[PDB]
């Protein structure tokens, strides 16, 4: 079950590592270009925290929900800010969010009382009048119900497919940093002048195996010069000596 545009849930993902590579083998998506930044730097850019927002969109008008564009479901629904720190991902989810008669569990709000500030969880609905007609629990002339359920039909096809879209909001170096993407690991080469980097241990030198062992609370090793000379290996549990030149 996937969140809609009216009941959009701010999913909070924290205290892990966020690799966006397992989604590529699913299907050719409707779109791939992230809107705030380029899609070629999704991994190296480390952010403090991530906010996920899930949306089922009727039709194919996810273009109008953009940082710079508005619409019927972008001014009276979830509204993307024009200074949005994050990006989008949309993909054709016809296998889950469709029905043969209609996806009547969902809803859309075509219009509201007034234009809403972005990042506002607008979920309250009410009967709407026509200009100045008094409307209190009545329906018919000048009192029409402004909501209608989603209708999925096989005769609709292209132009009414869901294209499930998740937006991701980031923060640029102001909070504690818990979640981002990892890097690659290059295998150790012994007795070779390598420019080593053990999670930030910048320096150049050759690598040997050290007979001494560290305690489980120990990770580094110093000397008289107060610099790194023998450290525990990052992704494997043995102690490696940095022999200098």
């Amino acid at each position, epitope marked *: 079950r996937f969140a809609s545009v009216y009941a959009w849930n701010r999913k909070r993902i924290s205290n892990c590592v966020a690799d966006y590579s397992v989604l590529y083998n699913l299907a050719p998506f409707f779109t791939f270009k992230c809107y705030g930044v380029s899609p070629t730097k999704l991994n190296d850019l480390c952010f403090t925290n991530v906010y996920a927002d899930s949306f089922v969109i009727r039709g194919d008008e996810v273009r109008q929900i953009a940082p710079g564009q508005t619409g019927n479901i972008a001014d009276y629904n979830y509204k993307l800010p024009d200074d949005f720190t994050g990006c989008v991902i949309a993909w054709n989810s*016809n296998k889950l969010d469709s029905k*043969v008669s209609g996806n009547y569990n969902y809803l859309y709000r075509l219009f509201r009382k007034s234009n809403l500030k972005p990042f506002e969880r607008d979920i309250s609905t009410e009967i709407y009048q026509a200009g100045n007609k008094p409307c209190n629990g009545v329906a018919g002339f000048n009192c029409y119900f402004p909501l209608r359920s989603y209708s999925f039909r096989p005769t609709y096809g292209v132009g009414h497919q869901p294209y499930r879209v998740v937006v991701l909001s980031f923060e640029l170096l102001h909070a504690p940093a818990t979640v981002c993407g990892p890097k690659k690991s290059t295998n150790l080469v012994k007795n070779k002048c390598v420019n080593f980097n053990f999670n930030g241990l910048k320096g150049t030198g050759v690598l040997t195996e050290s007979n001494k062992k560290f305690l489980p609370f120990q990770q580094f090793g110093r000397d008289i010069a107060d610099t790194t000379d023998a450290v525990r290996d990052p992704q494997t549990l043995e102690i490696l000596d940095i022999t200098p030149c």
Partner: antibody
Amino acid sequence: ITLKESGPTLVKPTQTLTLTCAFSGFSLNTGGAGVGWIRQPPGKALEWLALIYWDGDKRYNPSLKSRLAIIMDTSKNRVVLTMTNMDPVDTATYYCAHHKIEYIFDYWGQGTLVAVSS
Amino acid sequence: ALTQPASVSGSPGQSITVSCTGTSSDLGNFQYVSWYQHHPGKAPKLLIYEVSKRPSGVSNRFSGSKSGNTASLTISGLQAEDEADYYCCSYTTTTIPVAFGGGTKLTVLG
């Protein structure tokens, strides 16, 4: 996956049909998937009675609501399907299938051959 | 509703094309058809799921293509047990939503 359909064969025209269609092995934690109830009259165009998803909502055929009723089990046993005041135009065989929104039909059962006793 | 010829015959062994058609207003279309065969007194099973993919664990001598309102299959490798009942199905948006072909009666030519 195996689907077994069980029910009476020698059925009176005034007798309600109680048919159980049983499945063995499915990922029920999904949406848009269900079971379909499929008729085979001989030599004519076949017609459909009921497709039921796991949401419990009803999608009945138009102008045939008085000939069909659907009963859950909620214990992964089967689905109970009851036909009330059946007509002798449908001396036929009955089948049940896995029907979802992208795959049309997935896997079938053995099916039951029933005729009118009049 | 769907329509198809009843008496279907052609070249034995290979090179036979079978088709389903109908009306674009009565049959609402835009749903990918599936097509099935029934055996007299035996256990039946669908030969073509959607228009054009081939699942694993079954015979891979079949092909299909659907354009507009007309669907078709090319059938190869006809043995002596090629007798069946070919029923094609789609979504009819007017009434009786799931229709099943028009009926076929095929002979053997082994």
